[PDB]
Every structure is written in structure tokens, then in C-alpha cells.
Amino acid sequence: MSLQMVTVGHNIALIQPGFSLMNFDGQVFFFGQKGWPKRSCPTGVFHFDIKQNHLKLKPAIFSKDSCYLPPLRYPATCSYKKHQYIIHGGKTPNNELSDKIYIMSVACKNNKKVTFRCTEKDLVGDVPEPRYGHSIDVVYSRGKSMGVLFGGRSYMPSTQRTTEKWNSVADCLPHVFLIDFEFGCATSYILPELQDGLSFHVSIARNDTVYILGGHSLASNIRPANLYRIRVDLPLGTPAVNCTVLPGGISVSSAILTQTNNDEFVIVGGYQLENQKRMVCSLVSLGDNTIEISEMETPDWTSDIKHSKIWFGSNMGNGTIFLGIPGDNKSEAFYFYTLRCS
DNA sequence: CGGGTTTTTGTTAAGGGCTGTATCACTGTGTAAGACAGGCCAGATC
């Protein structure tokens, strides 16, 4: 609700649109910098902390058994519960979409010195093609976990890809993929309630249901206001997945999800039209099976945002939301704000 | 096949004048950040 200016230290150039902040025990960690990692930090994972409205990026190291994951510009982050995250897909600095899947965690911690353990996972079966801008969630059904991947964009197939349109992209199939983190197996489910490739959407996870919000469709160049429900079930045989469309959706892409209190989320940022930008917020309340998308009072935006053309941010995790806008080039290429909701 | 006769070229005894080429001393394009090793203060500490 309250906006605030935050100054960045010397390595401000390492922040680019598409970064991914990750939180481990009330500690936000930066990831997804610009270019390949230099000798200042061979790993590329920073300590995103703010003291008295001032940003200082500190480096971090990995354990003696990690895997030096490359920087990714549009992965699909996801929490998991010891506590650990999952990274899948994204654009490498060489403009190559990665097909692997990553698992970050903490190995040793003392005196604010965190040592990570990056473990690569081998996925077999109905594996998804390399994507970017998609989402993945975890559902809990009958004492079991399962990853729910959906959406995303990718290049043309290896046969239909020509060098004259080498950078052309298209939406992926509306299939739903369940990923078992223990065995490392995927499974492709096609559903009759999904006919449009969706990307840059918002996903809300619960015990057994995930809620898809907004997005964009390249096949139509439209911002549909959709509200989907996917209640994954985990019986003793084969997991049965169902879908359901719900009224009262939001038309937005590239929004920022957060969590103020339990069982209620807040949406901020995004884009209504191509040249139009979403300035209002949105409150999302949850229950046992019901959903409610309401409206709250818009924050006091400054003259910088109201006339900017693009912005990018991510959930800090503890109610706050990081945000950045471009600027002059010569100078400071980007200004950065923080927004708290509590 | 030759004499006799013709046509169309060479030709330097020396100067005037137009045209082409070597010569001279220089020029512009190489033009922003990253790695690293030493020094020094705040600080956990046995």
C-alpha cells in the first residue's frame, strides 16, 4: 500500500528484467543476473537485503557437491516443503532454452553465511519441451506431493525452425504435466477445457487445487479474463485431474503474486492492454472450495510509474514486493522501488 | 623469275607544347571495464 525509494549499490547493472528472488527463512536471495557470472561471484546467487532503504548485493558460494546452474531469465520458481525451491526452464545468456530442472536448498548456515546445495534432477517420460514464462506449483493430496506445470512459450520445432525467423516464438500446448519429484517422472494430461496456449499467467496453489489467472495468447493477441480450477487427486492408482472454469476473472499478464496473510493473496502490477498498464491492485480471498477476487484502494503512485512504459518485479516473500522501472542511459538505467502490503 | 616505276615509311642534324607519372610528407580506421593482491578496521572470540 506504501511505496518507497530504494538505492542500489555499485553492481546495479547485474539486475535485468526477469530475475527471480528466492526467500529462505526470512532471507531474500537474488538470482538471474545479466550476462555470465564474473569473478566477483562465480555462482551468480546474491544476498538480496535492504537496510534503511538501501540495497547491497552480497555474493554467495555453493557446497562441494552442487551444480553451477546457468543464469536464467524466465524460470518457473516454486516453493516446496526440508524447505527448498524448484527451477525449470528459462533463457540462458546464449538465448538457449534449458530443458533441465533444478532444486536449490541450504546446506550450512552460520553468521549470516549461507552455503547452497544445487542438485540437478533427471526427468523422464512425458517431459516438457524447453519453455519460458510458464508456472509450476505443488499440490498435497493424501499425504503426497506433485508438481503441476502448465503454459509457457518456446521456439518453433526443429523441423519448422528457419534461420530467417530464428527468433520466432509460439505458445505451447495447453497440456497439463504432473511431475513426481521422487522418481523424476512426468505425465501428460490433455483436458477438454483448455484450447488456448497461455503464457505470463498467475498461479495460486492450495492443498489440492491450483488457480490460473490471466496471461496472454499469441494465437489471438488477447488478454482473456479467465479463472480456472485444477483439482488434482492422488489415489492409490493413477492421478485423476479435472478442470473447471469460473466466472469473475482478471485480464492481466506478467502480474506479481504475493501473500499478506494465510489463505489470501494480493495481485499488483501487470498489463491490461499493449500500451495500457494495470495500475489498480486486486485482493484474492480463499476458503475451502470458494474463491473471491475483490478490489482494494490503489497505492499512491508517483509520476514516474504513471508515465513509464514497462516495469518488472518479483515477490520478496514477507509481504513486500520489489519493483523496478527503467530510466536514462549514458547514468542510471533502472530505478527500483519496494511496495509493502501488510 | 628481274629493270623501271610507283606508293607509303624511316629518319635525327634541333626545338615547342601538351600529357602522364613519380615524389614528398603526412592522414584516418585500431579508444571501457574486469581481475586481483595488498592494506585496513569492525567484530566473534577463548
Swiss-Prot record:
Q: Which GO terms describe its biological process?
A: B cell differentiation; B cell homeostatic proliferation; B cell lineage commitment; defense response to bacterium; DN2 thymocyte differentiation; DNA recombination; mature B cell differentiation involved in immune response; negative regulation of T cell differentiation in thymus
Q: Which UniProt keywords apply?
A: Chromatin regulator, DNA recombination, Metal-binding, Nucleus, Zinc, Zinc-finger
Location in the cell reads: Nucleus
Q: Which superkingdom is the protein from?
A: Eukaryota
Keyword set includes Transcription? no
| Primary location group | nucleus
User: What do the Gene Ontology cellular component annotations say?
Assistant: nucleoplasm; nucleus
MF annotations from Gene Ontology: chromatin binding; DNA binding; histone H3K4me3 reader activity; phosphatidylinositol binding; phosphatidylinositol-3,4,5-trisphosphate binding; phosphatidylinositol-3,4-bisphosphate binding; phosphatidylinositol-3,5-bisphosphate binding; phosphatidylinositol-4,5-bisphosphate binding
Task: Tell me the outcome of changing residue 196 to N.
Answer: Does not affect the endonuclease activity of the RAG complex
**KO phenotype (gene knockout):** Mice are viable but fail to produce mature B or T-lymphocytes. Very immature lymphoid cells are present in primary lymphoid organs. These cells do not rearrange their immunoglobulin or T-cell receptor loci. Double knockout with TREX1 does not show a visible phenotype.
Establish whether keyword Metal-binding is in the entry: yes
Expression sites by tissue? Maturing lymphoid cells.
**Description of its domains:** The atypical PHD-type zinc finger recognizes and binds histone H3 trimethylated on 'Lys-4' (H3K4me3).
Described by its record, this protein's role is as follows: Core component of the RAG complex, a multiprotein complex that mediates the DNA cleavage phase during V(D)J recombination. V(D)J recombination assembles a diverse repertoire of immunoglobulin and T-cell receptor genes in developing B and T-lymphocytes through rearrangement of different V (variable), in some cases D (diversity), and J (joining) gene segments.
By sequence similarity, the record places it as follows: Belongs to the RAG2 family.
Q: How does it assemble?
A: Component of the RAG complex composed of core components RAG1 and RAG2, and associated component HMGB1 or HMGB2.
Could you tell me what this protein is called?
Answer: V(D)J recombination-activating protein 2
Residue range from the parent sequence:
1 to 351 of 527
